[PDB]
Amino acid sequence: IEFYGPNRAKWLGPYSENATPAYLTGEFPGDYGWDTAGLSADPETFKRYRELELIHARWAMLGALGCITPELLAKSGTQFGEAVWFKAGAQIFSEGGLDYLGNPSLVHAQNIVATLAVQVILMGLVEGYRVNGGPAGEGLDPLYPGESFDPLGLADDPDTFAELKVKEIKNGRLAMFSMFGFFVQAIVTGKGPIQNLDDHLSNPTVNNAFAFATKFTPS
Amino acid sequence: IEFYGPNRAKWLGPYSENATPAYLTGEFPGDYGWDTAGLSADPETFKRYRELELIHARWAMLGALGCITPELLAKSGTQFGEAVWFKAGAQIFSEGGLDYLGNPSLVHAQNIVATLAVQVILMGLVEGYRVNGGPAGEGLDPLYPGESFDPLGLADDPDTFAELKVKEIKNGRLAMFSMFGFFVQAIVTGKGPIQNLDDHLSNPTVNNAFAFATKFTPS
Amino acid sequence: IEFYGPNRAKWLGPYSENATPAYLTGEFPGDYGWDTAGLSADPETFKRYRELELIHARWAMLGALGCITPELLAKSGTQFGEAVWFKAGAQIFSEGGLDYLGNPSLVHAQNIVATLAVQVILMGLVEGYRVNGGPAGEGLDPLYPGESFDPLGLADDPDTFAELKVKEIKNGRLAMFSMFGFFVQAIVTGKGPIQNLDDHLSNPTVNNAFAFATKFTPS
Numbered sequence: 001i002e003f004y005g006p007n008r009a010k011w012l013g014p015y016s017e018n019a020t021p022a023y024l025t026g027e028f029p030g031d032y033g034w035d036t037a038g039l040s041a042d043p044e045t046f047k048r049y050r051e052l053e054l055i056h057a058r059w060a061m062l063g064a065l066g067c068i069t070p071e072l073l074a075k076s077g078t079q080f081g082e083a084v085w086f087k088a089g090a091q092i093f094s095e096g097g098l099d100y101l102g103n104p105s106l107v108h109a110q111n112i113v114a115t116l117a118v119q120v121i122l123m124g125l126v127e128g129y130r131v132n133g134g135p136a137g138e139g140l141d142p143l144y145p146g147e148s149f150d151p152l153g154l155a156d157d158p159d160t161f162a163e164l165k166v167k168e169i170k171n172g173r174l175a176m177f178s179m180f181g182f183f184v185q186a187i188v189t190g191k192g193p194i195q196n197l198d199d200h201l202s203n204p205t206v207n208n209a210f211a212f213a214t215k216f217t218p219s
Numbered sequence: 220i221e222f223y224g225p226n227r228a229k230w231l232g233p234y235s236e237n238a239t240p241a242y243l244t245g246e247f248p249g250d251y252g253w254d255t256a257g258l259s260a261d262p263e264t265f266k267r268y269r270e271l272e273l274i275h276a277r278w279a280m281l282g283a284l285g286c287i288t289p290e291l292l293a294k295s296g297t298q299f300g301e302a303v304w305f306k307a308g309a310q311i312f313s314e315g316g317l318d319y320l321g322n323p324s325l326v327h328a329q330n331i332v333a334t335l336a337v338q339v340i341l342m343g344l345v346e347g348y349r350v351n352g353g354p355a356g357e358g359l360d361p362l363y364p365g366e367s368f369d370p371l372g373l374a375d376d377p378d379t380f381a382e383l384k385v386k387e388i389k390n391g392r393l394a395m396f397s398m399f400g401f402f403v404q405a406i407v408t409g410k411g412p413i414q415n416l417d418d419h420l421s422n423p424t425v426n427n428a429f430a431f432a433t434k435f436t437p438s
Numbered sequence: 439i440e441f442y443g444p445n446r447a448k449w450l451g452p453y454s455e456n457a458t459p460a461y462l463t464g465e466f467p468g469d470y471g472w473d474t475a476g477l478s479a480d481p482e483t484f485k486r487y488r489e490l491e492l493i494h495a496r497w498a499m500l501g502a503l504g505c506i507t508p509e510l511l512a513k514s515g516t517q518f519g520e521a522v523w524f525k526a527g528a529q530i531f532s533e534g535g536l537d538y539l540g541n542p543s544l545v546h547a548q549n550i551v552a553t554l555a556v557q558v559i560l561m562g563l564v565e566g567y568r569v570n571g572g573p574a575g576e577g578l579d580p581l582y583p584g585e586s587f588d589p590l591g592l593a594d595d596p597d598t599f600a601e602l603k604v605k606e607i608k609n610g611r612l613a614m615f616s617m618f619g620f621f622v623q624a625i626v627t628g629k630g631p632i633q634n635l636d637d638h639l640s641n642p643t644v645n646n647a648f649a650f651a652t653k654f655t656p657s
């Protein structure tokens with residue numbers, strides 16, 4: 001319970017090998033000291049890796065929640081068409097464009113190339129202004145700004161804020177691994193991941209993983 | 220990102236010809252140094268042009284939003300009759316006067332000459348009191364007053380206020396150019412501009428502009 | 439028109455953001471300052487990237503001309519069999535080995551493992567002697583030697599030689615991007631790229647790209 005210090009929860013716990021690599025000793029969230037290959041020895045490259053991992057973690061968390069929500073919403077009391085995240089990308093082609101919420105009173109996007117061009121414009125703008133700053137105050141911090149992106153004001157107390165940093169990083173790692181699980185389930189079985197959840201909760205041991213283990217057999 | 224200074228985003232960027240005309244060097248929003256004819260060499264006439272351009276920009280922005288909103292509102296979930304801005308001016312003549320929102324429980328203006336006379340009276344009053352001041356404090360500034368027209372109080376911090384000035388001017392220029400586009404679409408094809416939007420999004424390249432290029436052919 | 443200097447044609451030209459990364463300011467061809475990720479901050483690794491990009495550029499230019507020539511030659515007045523670069527690699531297996539120019543009086547390579555072994559021997563020799571030098575004078579420059587590889591003598595005048603450097607790098611970048619296009623056309627449509635050229639020149643807009651956009655649809 002001492003991540004910011006030498007007594008952090010190390011990568012093997014009581015198999016910790018307390019001779020840790022000296023280029024990271026606490027002082028940054030998520031430092032669990034698991035460097036078996038050591039691709040981040042250089043400090044500026046290490047900083048790039050911190051920024052890159054933060055970006056990956058936030059994007060992956062957003063995608064993971066986006067993979068949990070719509071299927072459950074369409075399973076509970078709404079209808080989307082194909083709420084499973086495979087053909088949600090092809091819902092614009094099928095019959096009447098991509099109707100949001102499965103309702104012909106919402107977005108109803110007919111042409112995907114318009115989404116394409118506007119998306120490129122907006123994403124270029126937001127990513128450029130993410131790197132170099134811009135609106136809502138010029139960006140002075142590349143890792144965590146501290147400017148008007150926290151309209152509630154939770155970043156006053158420092159140690160709870162650092163605990164929030166560590167929770168953010170751990171949640172992002174879990175989100176990245178879980179989205180890898182989503183992608184592998186997309187490959188192997190190619191069905192709904194929450195359909196997978198229901199089917200495994202209905203079938204705990206008879207259809208576990210290895211009925212789907214003789215599919216990609218070369219011959 | 221330095222509009223208020225010699226390092227403003229000039230009219231050609233890195234084709235800037237940094238020998239700019241010396242009668243404008245920053246210190247005013249929208250100064251992009253593009254004076255190829257030079258019709259504003261005199262300083263008082265230049266001030267007139269700043270005031271005139273501000274008036275044109277605000278009026279054109281109002282008109283542009285007025286050209287985007289009603290068609291979308293009548294396309295989504297309401298009905299107006301002719302929501303396209305052509306015969307919206309003739310909606311008072313058709314059958315039952317100009318019913319607002321397409322509802323016979325709202326304005327229901329029967330005689331257009333009454334709108335005419337009251338509009339002249341009100342417009343004369345508001346423009347005279349715009350020039351020379353009057354209510355809500357006497358007008359001491361012709362460009363931006365600073366009196367009780369900003370009930371929220373966003374004009375405290377000066378540099379963000381200047382950035383707001385520049386955004387206002389750029390939005391006004393875009394609005395003027397876009398309303399010119401609206402007028403040219405009114406002339407050439409004479410159909411709904413958002414109907415144009417939907418048709419070009421449905422037809423990106425087969426009906427682009429030059430099917431409507433052999434209409435005004437003299438003979 | 440000033441690549442060797444601060445006034446180079448930067449990556450956005452008129453959106454240049456003249457605060458360029460300081461680890462490259464001219465003095466080398468192809469320096470267009472477009473470092474959004476920054477994977478070449480280290481100077482020796484940057485040198486490796488210059489050498490590597492030169493090798494890639496020359497190899498890709500050779501491959502690109504090798505992808506333009508034979509199809510056109512077999513389309514104009516000669517015959518090769520499959521002049522399209524797909525089965526040109528399998529022309530040794532088909533009936534009578536790989537006959538050069540489509541003529542049974544030229545190379546007529548029967549066994550591909552002989553080409554294989556001789557190719558490995560020759561390529562190991564030339565690549566080793568490329569790295570460490572050797573014949574025709576020992577290699578003293580890893581980037582551009584200056585020894586007897588320019589039997590015409592165009593490297594006397596320095597500024598024209600530097601312009602040749604920049605042309606070489608730009609041609610190489612274009613060749614790499616174009617060969618990527620060749621590979622993507624090999625994947626998606628799997629037909630002749632110059633057959634693609636003729637078909638798009640015959641069909642400019644009816645078969646553009648998105649008839650070939652519903653092929654790799656998962657289900």
Ligand code: CHL
Nearest residue numbers: 051052053055056059120123124127180182183184474475
């Ligand atoms: C449109 C312009 C645009 C521009 C200029 C940038 C620019 C940038 N982005 Mg951004 N992005 C843009 C659009 C978008 N980005 C993202 C998502 C991200 C993420 C998630 C991240 C960035 C990052 C970055 C930075 C460097 C990334 C890089 O080197 O890419 C090179 C990479 C590729 C060309 C593709 C790499 C694919 C990857 C290997 C996936 C491999 C998949 C797995 C192996 C598993 C696959 C399936 C499963 C089942 C096994 C750079 C500033 C990174 C960053 O800021 O780090 C500090 C970062 O982490 N961008 C999305 C969402 C789709 C965009 C949509 O338009």
Ligand code: CHL
Nearest residue numbers: 486489490491493494497558561562565569618620621622
């Ligand atoms: C036979 C022995 C042989 C030896 C010892 C070398 C040795 C060397 N070569 Mg050479 N080569 C040899 C044969 C050949 N080379 C080349 C072509 C090249 C090129 C083009 C380059 C070198 C380079 C190098 C140097 C380091 C490259 C490396 O790290 O590879 C690791 C790489 C791989 C194992 C394969 C990488 C594949 C790559 C990722 C392709 C990805 C494809 C795209 C994503 C797109 C694909 C399809 C499209 C449609 C999307 C190294 C001195 C590089 C250099 O000198 O840089 C300064 C360099 O740029 N070699 C060819 C032509 C096929 C050879 C044929 O025999």
Ligand code: CLA
Nearest residue numbers: 030031032033034035039040049050053056173176177180
């Ligand atoms: C691309 C995503 C990515 C990136 C850049 C990083 C980056 C980093 N991680 Mg990290 N991590 C990730 C995903 C990622 N992580 C995921 C998904 C998990 C959960 C499994 C973890 C769990 C983890 C732990 C437990 C620790 C780190 C640590 C680190 C730091 C040092 C290690 C390093 O140099 O990594 C460089 C990484 C790369 C260059 C990415 C290479 C990716 C290629 C494609 C190979 C991946 C193949 C993979 C092994 C096959 C199975 C995939 C499956 C497991 C998902 C560095 C900031 C250590 C640290 O000190 O934290 C700050 C540490 O203790 N990570």
Ligand code: CLA
Nearest residue numbers: 249250251252253254258259268269272275392395396399
């Ligand atoms: C009538 C509207 C109007 C007026 C009075 C001004 C006034 C001004 N603009 Mg301006 N501008 C406008 C509309 C207008 N603008 C629009 C719509 C755009 C976008 C295309 C711009 C883009 C623009 C830039 C990029 C710059 C200016 C600048 C200036 C200032 C110096 C130039 C000058 O003396 O203009 C005098 C203008 C007139 C006397 C108007 C004459 C109008 C007649 C009918 C001719 C128009 C015909 C037209 C060319 C045909 C195509 C129309 C189509 C492009 C819409 C001055 C304050 C410069 C500056 O320093 O900013 C402060 C500068 O750098 N403007």
Ligand code: CLA
Nearest residue numbers: 468469470471472473477478487488491494611614615618
């Ligand atoms: C592998 C090929 C390769 C390599 C090693 C380089 C290397 C370099 N380029 Mg470069 N470039 C290339 C291909 C390549 N280029 C191509 C094909 C284009 C045309 C699109 C360009 C256009 C370009 C510009 C405009 C600029 C550079 C610059 C640079 C330098 C700094 C950037 C850097 O660190 O790159 C490191 C690169 C790599 C480590 C390669 C990673 C490759 C992986 C597979 C990711 C690629 C995925 C790709 C984005 C997906 C779409 C591919 C499609 C666009 C082809 C460096 C010497 C900058 C400079 O200063 O020039 C000297 C600069 O301004 N390049």
Ligand SMILES: CC(=C/C=C/C(C)=C/C=C/C=C(C)/C=C/C=C(\C)C=C=C1C(C)(C)C[C@H](O)C[C@@]1(C)O)/C=C/[C@@]12O[C@]1(C)C[C@@H](O)CC2(C)C
Nearest residue numbers: 439440441442443445446447448468600601602604605608
């Ligand atoms: C109206 C008109 C305009 C011409 C436009 C041109 C010439 C565009 C070419 C435009 C071509 C241009 C600009 C190319 C210019 C090349 C340059 C600058 C070279 C360069 C570079 C860079 C950037 C690498 C930078 C490097 O560091 C230095 C340097 C020097 O290497 C033509 C009309 C006619 O063609 C018709 C219509 C019908 C005919 O019958 C009659 C006529 C009159 C001839």
Ligand SMILES: CC1=C[C@H](O)CC(C)(C)[C@H]1/C=C/C(C)=C/C=C/C(C)=C/C=C/C=C(C)/C=C/C=C(C)/C=C/C1=C(C)C[C@H](O)CC1(C)C
Nearest residue numbers: 035036037038056059060063066067085088176177179180
């Ligand atoms: C550390 C280390 C160390 C040692 O030394 C070495 C090694 C081992 C190599 C290393 C490792 C590495 C790794 C593992 C990595 C991984 C990563 C990942 C997983 C990522 C993900 C990542 C991921 C991510 C980002 C994701 C993202 C996502 C997204 C956006 C999504 C989207 C979406 C959504 C919403 C929904 C819809 O409907 C669809 C989609 C489209 C689906």
Ligand SMILES: CC1=C[C@H](O)CC(C)(C)[C@H]1/C=C/C(C)=C/C=C/C(C)=C/C=C/C=C(C)/C=C/C=C(C)/C=C/C1=C(C)C[C@H](O)CC1(C)C
Nearest residue numbers: 254255256257275278279282285286304307395396398399
């Ligand atoms: C700068 C310069 C420089 C150089 O040197 C020379 C030159 C070139 C000459 C110059 C230029 C100029 C120009 C271009 C100008 C333009 C302008 C414009 C466009 C305006 C508009 C302008 C415009 C405007 C105001 C507008 C306004 C509008 C409005 C009110 C509207 C109204 C409406 C609405 C609401 C709706 C309904 O249903 C109808 C209507 C009725 C429709």
Ligand SMILES: CC1=C[C@H](O)CC(C)(C)[C@H]1/C=C/C(C)=C/C=C/C(C)=C/C=C/C=C(C)/C=C/C=C(C)/C=C/C1=C(C)C[C@H](O)CC1(C)C
Nearest residue numbers: 473474475476494497498501504505523526614615617618
């Ligand atoms: C710069 C940067 C920056 C930022 O920061 C980040 C990023 C974006 C990542 C980066 C980028 C990168 C990139 C893009 C790369 C690319 C590359 C390429 C494309 C290469 C090619 C490359 C390519 C190449 C070499 C090629 C080569 C080729 C060859 C040999 C060929 C051969 C051949 C021939 C003759 C013909 C026959 O019949 C067949 C064949 C076999 C076909």
